[model samples]
Target: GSSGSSGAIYVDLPNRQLKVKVADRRVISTTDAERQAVTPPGLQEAINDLVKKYTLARAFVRPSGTEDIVRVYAEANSQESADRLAYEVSLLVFQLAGGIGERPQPSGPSSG
Candidate 1:
């Protein structure tokens, strides 16, 4: 599937530590002695909230190292579920992590 820097939940700064604490990564991109930093205040909290709902599947957030925006992605049992994960993920980031816009609104689905 395609990916994007939606910027809906996007944020930046001291990302290396945040990334490690959250997901842990590699491909070391920085040549600077930039280490030892802190994680965002609400990030881990919102993530747990999401975890409560979607732990069976997968969803998360991380500052897109270069794009300078938070990003996370995961697949689900289906496509709508995949999109829903993104929607909810954004919601938590907005609700807890100080999102910068109108509240995140999920699209219409299952008109039953």
Candidate 2:
């Protein structure tokens, strides 16, 4: 429903268009902060290679109108693989996205 930006990547669906964008507002800073940096270009390449090897994934797109969110929806052989790929894809997005301004406080809630 939203309009993606230039940097956004899109895949054409039968009924809708998937879009990806790099924005400050919607970009997710940390999904698993304890987790180490898991997304590497090589990993992404490997994922792509897997897609070709399996010949199941069709396309991945970041949803439109997402100022800082990279959306991805693709065809996969199995739902399990799809879930795994989605997580990987999200990590990819987190790495690819530029740094957000003024890091949010990492401190937990304080006692009043």
Candidate 3:
């Protein structure tokens, strides 16, 4: 009953050399496994709250193996809605999950 979007963004951390591969390890080499290792219950809880608020169809996050940032994905009613959802999720991850670099801003919208 709704359109959706898939996107990706990076949330940089404090250290790049000492903490580039933030986690010492991962059970899998795909998906949010990397980001998940750092903040266990908080991110999942955050997702639960976030998805409910937007009535979204799907929301997921992942981390880059060789990089130093987290990835974001959100599905919602429309492209605009999905963009915001992704932004807010990225923002929350930056806020709670651990962030020390430039923060994510809600993208401005609307034209016509």
Question: Which residue runs of candidate 3 sit more than 4 Å off their true CA positions?
Answer: 1-39
For model 2, state the Cα shift of residue 57 in Å.
2.2
- The residue-level lDDT of candidate 1 at 109 comes to 72
Ranking by TM-score: 3, 1, 2
> Which number leads on TM-score?
3
lDDT, candidate 1, at 6: 50
Candidate 1, residues 1-112, lDDT tens digits: the string is 8877654655321111111222223333331244355354444555556545653455666665665455555445555666666666666554344444444455577677
lDDT (Cα, tens digit) per residue for candidate 3, span 1-112: 9999978866532111111123323433222343534556566776778767765445677765556666666767666557676666666655454543555565677578
Please, what is the TM-score per model? 0.45, 0.40, 0.54
Better of 1 and 2 by lDDT: 1
lDDT, model 1, position 39: 53
Instruction: Pick the winner on TM-score between candidates 2 and 3.
Output: 3
Off by over 4 Å in 1: 1-52, 102-105, 110-112
Reference-based TM-score, model 2:
0.40
Q: Which ten residues in a row have the lowest lDDT in candidate 2?
A: 99-108
lDDT score for residue 63 of model 1? 62
Q: Give a tens-digit lDDT track for model 2, residues 5-109.
A: 586558632211223344554335443233445543344466678667653654364433535455655456655455445544554554555433332222233
Q: Report the error of model 1 at residue 24, Å.
A: 23
Q: What lDDT is reached at residue 21 by model 1? A: 22
For every model shown, the clashing-pair count is 1, 8, 0
